[PDB]
Scaffold this active site. Structure first.
Site, PDB file in Angstrom:
ATOM      1  CG  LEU A   1      -1.991  -1.093   1.176  1.00 54.97           C
ATOM      2  CD1 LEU A   1      -2.792  -1.073   2.456  1.00 54.97           C
ATOM      3  CD2 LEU A   1      -2.893  -0.934  -0.031  1.00 54.97           C
ATOM      4  CG  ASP A   2       1.097   3.755  -2.755  1.00 57.54           C
ATOM      5  OD1 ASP A   2       2.160   3.113  -2.644  1.00 57.54           O
ATOM      6  OD2 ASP A   2       0.480   3.871  -3.833  1.00 57.54           O
ATOM      7  CB  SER A   3       1.820   7.779   2.119  1.00 57.91           C
ATOM      8  OG  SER A   3       1.571   8.574   0.973  1.00 57.91           O
TER       9      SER A   3
ATOM     10  CG  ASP B   1      -3.233   2.756  -0.991  1.00 63.94           C
ATOM     11  OD1 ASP B   1      -4.274   3.186  -1.516  1.00 63.94           O
ATOM     12  OD2 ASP B   1      -2.262   2.311  -1.639  1.00 63.94           O
ATOM     13  CB  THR B   2      -1.632   4.750   5.334  1.00 62.78           C
ATOM     14  OG1 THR B   2      -0.507   4.081   4.750  1.00 62.78           O
ATOM     15  CG2 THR B   2      -1.573   4.621   6.837  1.00 62.78           C
TER      16      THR B   2
END
Ligand code: SF4
Ligand code: SF4
Ligand code: SF4
Lengths: 168, 61, 170, 123, 387, 190, 68, 340, 77, 116
Positions: free
Chosen positions: I36-38, I40-41
């Site tokens: 995941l990405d920042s 997505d967090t």
């Protein structure tokens, strides 16, 4: 008669004040200029607040009252925008003008710490140019469409704008 | 030169009225109060005598 | 059905039914003509002139015009003053909550085809682009005489409304 | 005018790229939290995850800017548009600027090759 | 958590203006306010950079559309200060007394419109009537009504008719009765005095910190007026008292407006007696048009008549900020000359701009009907504030 | 003398110190007399008498389709193109009216006609944006476009509102009398 | 002014048939003198009478019912 | 059965047909109060225009807001209208000439005015916007608060009468009026009279500037003629109350001295002329009074609500209790107690 | 809370950019394990608090880097 | 059969003749055409009607007195005047407590510039 003689005795007076100002705060004044009793002061961008305190606080120099601020661009030069201030010593019946400069990226600080009405004025010249005022609550656009993008008083920006309106 | 344009009269105009034209009209306020009590008391003299008159008419009925 | 039939601009009453319908139409159009309730929309240099009609030189109460500034009681709307980008949805919404026998009149030169701000960025190029306007009142200070004349033009249109005659589908 | 409005903050310029990143992350959380409020308030035709997949891709547009201070002006503009949408200040006509592509499927003959550009001399 | 915050007026809350105005009411008490202006915002400043000063002049009677003539005057003053020219004597007096009948008009609209906004219906008609009498006096001089294609940056557009200077005296004698008449049912007036006794107090140093001016600053107690502090246009040469209020209330801001009728009538008495003779435009044909008598006769007048209407007149580079005392307040203008014939930039300082900006410093705590009496005595005509 | 510094001749003037405001006991009138004005509403009935006096006086309004308000010769309303004596169009395309119409309502194309003199091919005002500056009147050397003081020309379509050359020459045909009357009072003061 | 005496006396001066037309035409009673007529056909008047407000003096009597 | 159904129709065309020309008359007044002409384009001398108002108003639509119970927006117009219309029984029109004489006149006369608040409180609840609700609150609180003093002087009037029949009061009032002894009573009654009606010395609550375009509901149509006609019925209804229990109700002077000069005997002409002059005295008092309402509507601005409640409970109503202490005492000094 | 992480897995499964929905273990790293990405967090964290209707502060939102920390936080209510 | 009872019955039918006349005469009946958290008050709204009840109620309490006032000569006077003189001080409770003051928090900052 040439309508400049009536100024002259005062104008030559005013210079003695103006030089005094540069002798007063040499850290922050890049220069002064005057042209037909309009005194104009030359301040670095990170230099605004220490001047404006002194312009408010001195007994010999109490301007007490913002009148209007705005910006003027000169896209020919490196620092693009320049920010101009106007005050009015209601005791001593005088005016003073304060010019700083700022690129569209970099800020100028807000004088809303001292001058209370100025927060409205700073709210104006934000939207017309994009020139910031760091240290300022209620910084947001005004006197334009809410969903507007760009800035109107900018010489690249076209006259009619980009978007027009019709009722679908 | 200058000819045909309008000019003031050589005698000038009359001085206009620019003050507060406010006459303190009417009477003294005490006169209004005393006239109020007079109109009242004459009305009461007409009222209560007529009421006692009506009571005697009630007796007569 | 007849292959030839007179246009509704050109027809005359010939049946006694048509005399009845035309007089009833005249009463309906007549009450619509006399009682005449616009809504105060005016916003700019084109709004003081709307108040100049309410002034005691060029009275509108003698015409029956009165500003019930409440669009549900309004017959028509007078778009007056310039019209900006930022306002225009409110203009549409004020047009929406109006009753059905409505009109709207474009007082002012900015209100039709942009006017003096035809080339600005945040402006609607006349209120054609929002509401269907039936009478324009030209004039950049659109004269009280001209504004009243626009109302009389609209009232002539009101005399030619034919709400009753169209039940016979003329 | 001593006091601000409800969500308006004093503008302040983060000295580091990380502090800017922290503010942007909190900001996207603010949009994502207030997104079901928007569909109620602006009375929109469509669904909430469409709002969310736009708010994601708009920050995807500006993921790859190098400068600190150009991301600073970009953050300030984003915070102002948040400030508009969290109140009634935008109206639903101005709110639906952000979905031109959703409301109407475009139309017949969207030009793709050279020829469809050419037959209408590039529109 | 926040108040059930309202939209004040979409269309017709305050007459002559689109006052969209957020209020947060907690007891019918404003804890804070936030007026969104921009609803009239035509963007005129972006336009006035693309037209010549010759053409750029009727942008400004559109601005502040209840007092056109002071806007006309302040731009003419900014350009005359910029051009280093001098309007002649006759021009000075004629511009002065038009700028004072416009003051009569402005307070005659504003006081009566505010009385209607409060609820007094009778001055709202008794004043607009005398305003129609003054529409006539705009009409004889210049174009139609309510938007005068008048004072040029060279001075004055043209001379009077042959008999306006007489006729205005016949009007000026009866304006005093027609003014004291409306004074008689608003000044003592325990309803009005109740509604306006301490409503919206404006202290002195806070009046300065909010940048306010004109009748408001003079109502707070500070004796400041551009007609007498930094004079011009033979306001020196005309005797003229100035009223100054005592409290910071709206009642001083009322009473000063009532007083300025009495003052600006005395202007007309000292003007119509002492109107001189002389050239009504500027002397030369190089910043305004030659008269149409001699341009059909002289070769030299044509080329000036042509270049002023194709190019226009050329302005020395520089920048000025000329501010004069509009009846709303100090109206300023900041023009930045290219040296070309278009203004490179021109800011206005509309007077009601800071008045609107100083709203929620004054309007805190008051009531919502009290949030109407505060409106039309800071005079938000809204033609001014956005532009 | 010498002033201090922070010190002009703008001292506070003579008697700027306002009096201490009067209390209940520093009042000349009796409490009964004051409260007579309180309860019996003196300044209420006073203004009531004012508006009653205005009931018995004359109104001002006029019957507009039957009476008209004041019209100056320098009033301006819709436009017209004048003609010469012995009927010639009087408009050359100097384009000054195009040059200084600050809303750009004017649009002209013009060609050299058969005889060789210059005349206007298409003359067109956008009356949506004719802003009644009247500068277009003051910009004609040959005095062709004028300001007809008509204002009663309210249209029902925007299509009707684009005055080309023909409508303006028809207006110059129509209002020719009044334009002569107006210029017989304005041509000095131009 | 607008008193009863003035409207009564001017109605008595003009004539009740023209009065009955005029009351259906305007709301006022007005007695002029026929200064002139129109090429379209419109009879004009002008009022001498002393009890008239400013710019109530001159007026039109039209021809068509559908005037403007 | 036949002569009473005409007795109610003639009263209807005496009242309902008159209340429209009242609304024409107010425009004519405020025209000459503000130096302009009244309606003149519409009728012969510009009469009749209330017909053109209503007939147009009956032709507009029944657009209804989505937040309003439509039944409620039917009930409140109808009940406010019929409240101000069934207040018309024991107005007296000459001696004992009412619609239905009943010995409790004032109690009906006052309980129906007490019902007068009940429609306007109910009306703002439909279209349940927060401003729309709180406006109904602000209206109803003053509308009860002066309904107090309106009710509360009716008892000190009948401290001279001691009888609830309305037409008994005027025959008591033959010896002298009640206004001319009790003068400041008239002043406080006149302001209390314009209070219970929606009049703008006092009706701040119809502030379109404060609300989101809201006067009360902006509910218009043939709904709109209902509250409107009820308002102008309320106007001259409270004028009628002012007429009988404070002013000369149908009395002018003695006029028997005149009659014995004129007639020689009772005849229907004599009843005709005496009923004429009694109705005309009632008419002239009533018609001066409806003018006075406009005459105070013109000359004054509106209030603050704080001013309005301060105007009720602090400045007027303790003076009313002072009346309650002086008029039984003045009754007690002399014998003077009224009997039925 | 029993079977709470089942509901967390139910919310977490409904996204995209997950190369293995059966990689949802109770010790799943967001950036590493879930890929995941920042953005997505906070996407999944706001989806969690929306699934429960509870509201969370900023730093406790910021520090949740794995679903283990989500189930660590979950018993604040 | 009396016109009194006819009067209160006929007027709802007159109102119905004015009610259904729009439903007969109109057309196009209904086309397509935040309030999250707060409501605001002072005691001055809520208290006026609640305090209004005893002061309305006492009028109907005083109402049987005024009809019978001749019978209660010089003594029902004394009783009712005691009743009033209880109620009047009951009234002047609130005016000294200022129960209808709706006072504003717009105070001009009484406290001066105490410095250093
Ligand atoms: S019509 Fe004229 S005054 Fe009105 S908005 Fe347009 S430019 Fe302004
Ligand atoms: S008055 Fe008309 S023709 Fe003249 S410049 Fe203005 S818009 Fe153009
Ligand atoms: S009317 Fe005048 S400005 Fe216009 S084209 Fe003709 S000569 Fe030129």
């Amino acid at each position: 008669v040439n309508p400049a003689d009536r100024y002259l005795q005062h104008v030559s007076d005013l210079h003695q004040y103006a030089k005094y100002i540069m002798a007063a705060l040499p850290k922050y004044i890049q220069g002064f200029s005057v042209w037909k009793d309009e005194l104009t002061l030359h301040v670095a961008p990170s230099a605004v607040i220490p001047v404006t305190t002194f312009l408010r606080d001195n007994t010999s120099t109490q301007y007490k009252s913002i009148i209007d601020i705005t910006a003027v661009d000169y896209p020919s030069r490196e620092n693009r925008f320049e920010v101009v201030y106007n005050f009015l010593s209601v005791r001593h019946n005088s005016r003073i003008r304060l010019k700083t400069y700022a690129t569209e990226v970099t800020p100028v600080p807000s004088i809303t710490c001292l001058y209370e009405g100025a927060n409205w004025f700073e709210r104006e010249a934000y939207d017309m140019y994009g020139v910031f005022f760091e240290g300022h609550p209620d910084l947001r656009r005004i006197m334009t469409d809410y969903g507007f993008e760009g800035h109107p008083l900018r010489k690249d920006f076209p006259l009619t704008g980009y978007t027009e309106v019709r009722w679908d | 030169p200058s000819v045909g344009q309008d000019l003031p009269p050589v005698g000038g105009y009359e001085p206009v009225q620019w003050r507060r034209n406010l006459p303190a009209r009417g009477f003294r306020p005490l006169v209004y109060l005393a006239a109020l009590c007079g109109i009242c008391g004459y009305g009461f003299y007409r009222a209560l005598g007529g009421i006692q008159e009506r009571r005697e008419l009630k007796r007569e009925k | 059905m007849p292959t030839d039939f007179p246009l509704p601009s050109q027809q005359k009453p010939n049946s006694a039914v048509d005399y009845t319908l035309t007089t009833l139409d005249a009463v309906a159009n007549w009450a619509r003509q006399g009682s005449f309730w616009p809504v105060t929309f005016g916003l700019a240099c084109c709004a003081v002139e709307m108040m100049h009609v309410s002034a005691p030189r060029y009275d509108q109460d003698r015409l029956g015009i009165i500003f019930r500034a409440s669009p549900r009681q309004s017959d028509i709307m007078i778009v007056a003053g310039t019209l900006t980008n930022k306002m225009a949805p409110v203009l549409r919404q004020v047009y929406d909550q109006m009753p059905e026998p409505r009109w709207v009149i474009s007082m002012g030169s900015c209100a039709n085809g942009g006017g003096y701000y035809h080339f600005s960025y945040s402006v609607v190029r006349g209120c054609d682009r929002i509401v269907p306007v039936d009478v324009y009142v030209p004039g950049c200070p659109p004269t009280s005489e001209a504004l009243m004349y626009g109302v009389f033009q609209l009232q002539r249109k009101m005399r030619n409304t034919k709400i009753t005659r169209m039940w016979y589908r003329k | 005018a001593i006091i601000a409005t409800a969500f308006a903050e004093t503008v302040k310029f983060s000295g580091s790229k990380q502090e800017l990143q922290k503010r942007t992350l909190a900001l996207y959380r603010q949009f994502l939290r207030g997104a079901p409020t928007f569909a109620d308030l602006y009375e929109v035709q469509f669904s909430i995850p469409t709002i969310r997949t736009k708010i994601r891709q708009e920050f995807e547009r500006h993921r790859f800017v190098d400068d600190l201070s150009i991301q600073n002006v970009l953050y300030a503009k984003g915070h102002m548009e948040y400030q508009e949408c969290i109140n009634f200040w935008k109206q639903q006509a101005q709110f639906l600027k952000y979905f031109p592509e959703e409301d109407d499927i475009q139309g017949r003959h969207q030009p793709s090759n050279f020829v469809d550009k050419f037959l209408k001399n590039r529109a | 958590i926040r108040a059930f915050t309202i939209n004040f007026g979409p269309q017709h809350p305050a007459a002559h203006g689109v006052l969209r105005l957020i209020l947060e009411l907690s007891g019918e008490e404003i804890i804070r306010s936030d007026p969104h202006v921009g609803l009239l915002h035509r963007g005129t400043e972006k336009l006035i950079e693309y037209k010549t000063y010759m053409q750029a002049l009727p942008y400004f009677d559109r601005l502040d559309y209840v007092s056109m003539m002071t806007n006309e005057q302040v731009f003419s003053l900014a350009v005359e200060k910029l051009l280093n020219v001098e309007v002649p004597l006759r021009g000075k007096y004629i511009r002065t007394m038009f700028g004072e009948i416009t003051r009569v008009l402005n307070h005659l609209m504003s006081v009566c419109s505010h009385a209607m906004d409060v609820g007094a219906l009778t001055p709202f008609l008794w004043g607009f009537e005398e305003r129609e009498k003054l529409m006539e006096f705009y009409e004889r001089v210049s174009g139609a009504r309510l938007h005068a294609a008048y004072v040029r940056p060279g001075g004055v557009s043209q001379d009077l008719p042959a008999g306006l200077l007489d006729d205005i005296y016949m009007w000026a004698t009866q304006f005093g009765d027609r003014l004291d008449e409306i004074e008689e049912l608003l000044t003592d007036n325990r309803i009005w005095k109740l509604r306006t006794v301490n409503i919206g107090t404006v202290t002195a140093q806070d009046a300065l910190n909010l940048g306010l001016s004109g009748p408001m600053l003079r109502g707070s107690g500070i004796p400041f007026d551009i007609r007498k502090n930094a004079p011009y246009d033979a306001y020196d040469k005309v005797d003229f008292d100035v009223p100054v209020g005592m409290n910071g209330d709206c009642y001083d801001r009322y009473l000063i407006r009532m007083a300025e009728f009495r003052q600006s009538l005395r202007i007309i008495e000292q003007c119509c007696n002492d109107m001189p003779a002389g050239a009504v435009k500027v002397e030369d044909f190089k910043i305004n048009s030659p008269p149409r008598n001699l341009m059909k006769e002289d070769m030299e007048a044509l080329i000036h008549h042509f270049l002023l209407y194709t190019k226009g007149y050329s302005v020395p580079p520089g920048e000025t900020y000329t501010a004069i005392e509009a009846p709303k307040g100090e109206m300023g203008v900041y023009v930045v000359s290219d040296g070309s014939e278009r203004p490179y930039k021109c800011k206005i300082r509309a007077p009601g701009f800071a008045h609107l900006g100083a709203f929620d410093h004054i309007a805190r705590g008051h009531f919502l009907p009290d949030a109407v009496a505060i409106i039309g005595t800071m005079d938000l005509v809204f033609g001014e504030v956005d532009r | 003398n010498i002033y201090a510094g922070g010190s002009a001749a703008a001292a506070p003037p003579a008697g700027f110190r306002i009096h201490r405001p009067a209390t209940w006991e520093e009042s000349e009138e009796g409490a009964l007399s004051k409260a007579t004005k309180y309860f019996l509403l003196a300044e209420m009935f006073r203004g009531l008498y004012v508006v009653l006096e205005q009931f018995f006086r004359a109104p001002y309004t006029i019957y507009y389709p039957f009476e008209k308000g004041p019209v100056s010769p320098r009033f301006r309303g819709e436009h017209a193109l004048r003609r010469y004596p012995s009927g010639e169009e009087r408009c050359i395309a100097c384009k000054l009216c195009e040059a200084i119409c600050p809303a750009l309502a004017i649009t002209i194309d013009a060609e050299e006609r058969i005889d060789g003199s210059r005349r206007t091919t298409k003359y067109d005002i956008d009356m949506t944006k004719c802003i009644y500056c009247g500068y277009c009147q003051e910009s004609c050397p040959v005095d062709a476009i004028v300001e007809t003081p008509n204002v009663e020309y309210a249209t029902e379509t925007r299509e009707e509102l684009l005055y080309n050359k023909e409508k303006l020459l028809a207006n110059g045909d129509k209002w020719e009398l009044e334009l002569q009357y107006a210029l017989d009072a304005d041509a000095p003061y131009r | 002014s607008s008193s009863l005496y003035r409207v009564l006396r001017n109605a008595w001066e003009v004539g009740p048939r023209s009065y009955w037309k005029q009351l259906n035409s305007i709301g006022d009673t007005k007695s002029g003198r026929l200064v002139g007529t129109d090429i379209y056909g419109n009879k004009f008047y002008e009022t001498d009478h002393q009890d008239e407000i400013h710019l109530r003096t001159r007026y039109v009597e039209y021809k068509e019912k559908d005037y403007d | 059965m036949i002569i009473n159904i005409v007795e109610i129709l003639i009263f209807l065309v005496c009242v309902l047909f008159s209340v429209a020309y009242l609304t024409v008359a107010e425009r004519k007044t405020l025209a000459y109060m503000q130096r302009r002409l009244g309606p003149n384009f519409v009728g012969y001398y510009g009469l009749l225009q209330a017909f053109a108002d209503a007939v147009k108003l009956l032709l507009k639509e029944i657009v209804l807001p989505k937040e309003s119970n439509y039944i409620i927006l039917v009930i409140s117009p109808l009940i406010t209208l019929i409240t101000a219309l069934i207040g018309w029984v024991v107005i007296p029109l000459g001696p004992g000439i009412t619609l239905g004489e009943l010995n409790l006149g004032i109690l009906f006369s006052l309980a129906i005015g007490s019902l007068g608040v009940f429609g306007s409180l109910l009306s703002g609840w439909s279209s349940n916007s927060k401003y729309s609700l709180l406006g109904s609150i602000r209206s109803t609180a003053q509308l009860i608060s002066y309904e107090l003093i309106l009710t509360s002087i009716f008892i000190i009037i009948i401290m001279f009468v001691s009888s609830l029949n309305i037409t008994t009061i005027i025959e008591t009032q033959r010896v002298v009026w009640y206004c001319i002894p009790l003068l400041p009573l008239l002043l406080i009654f006149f302001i209390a009279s314009v209070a219970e009606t929606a009049r703008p010395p006092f009706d701040l609550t119809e502030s379109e500037s404060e609300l989101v375009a809201g006067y009360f509901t902006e509910y218009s149509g043939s709904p709109f003629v209902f509250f409107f006609l009820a308002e102008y019925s309320n106007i001259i209804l409270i004028s009628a109350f002012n007429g009988y229990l404070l002013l000369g109700g149908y009395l002018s002077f003695n006029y028997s001295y005149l009659f014995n000069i004129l007639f020689n005997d009772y005849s229907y002409v004599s009843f005709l002329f005496e009923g004429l002059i009694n109705s005309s005295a009632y008419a002239i008092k009533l018609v001066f009074l409806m003018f006075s309402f406009i005459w105070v509507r013109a000359a004054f601005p509106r209030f603050t609500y704080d001013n309005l409640i301060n105007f009720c409970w602090i400045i007027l109503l303790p003076l009313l209790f002072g009346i309650f202490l002086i008029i039984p005492s003045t009754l007690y000094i002399f014998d003077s107690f009224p009997t039925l | 809370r029993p079977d709470a992480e089942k509901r967390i897995a139910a919310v977490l499964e409904s996204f995209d950019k997950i190369s293995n929905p059966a990689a949802i273990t109770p010790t799943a790293s967001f950036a590493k394990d879930l890929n995941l990405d920042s953005l997505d967090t906070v996407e999944v964290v706001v989806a969690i608090e929306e699934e429960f209707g509870i509201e969370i502060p900023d730093k406790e939102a910021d520090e949740i880097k794995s679903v283990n920390q989500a189930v660590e936080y979950i018993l604040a209510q | 059969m009396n016109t009194f009872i006819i009067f209160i019955i006929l007027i709802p039918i007159v109102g119905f003749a004015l009610l259904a006349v729009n439903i007969l005469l109109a057309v196009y009946k209904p086309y397509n055409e935040f309030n999250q958290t707060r409501l605001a008050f002072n005691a001055a709204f809520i208290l006026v009607a609640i305090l209004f009840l005893p002061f309305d109620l006492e009028i109907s309490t005083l109402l049987p007195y005024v009809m019978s006032i001749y019978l209660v000569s010089n003594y029902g006077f004394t009783i009712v005047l005691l009743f009033l003189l209880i109620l009047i001080i009951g009234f002047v409770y609130e005016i000294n407590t200022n129960a209808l003051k709706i006072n504003k928090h717009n105070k001009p900052n009484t406290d001066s510039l105490i410095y250093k």
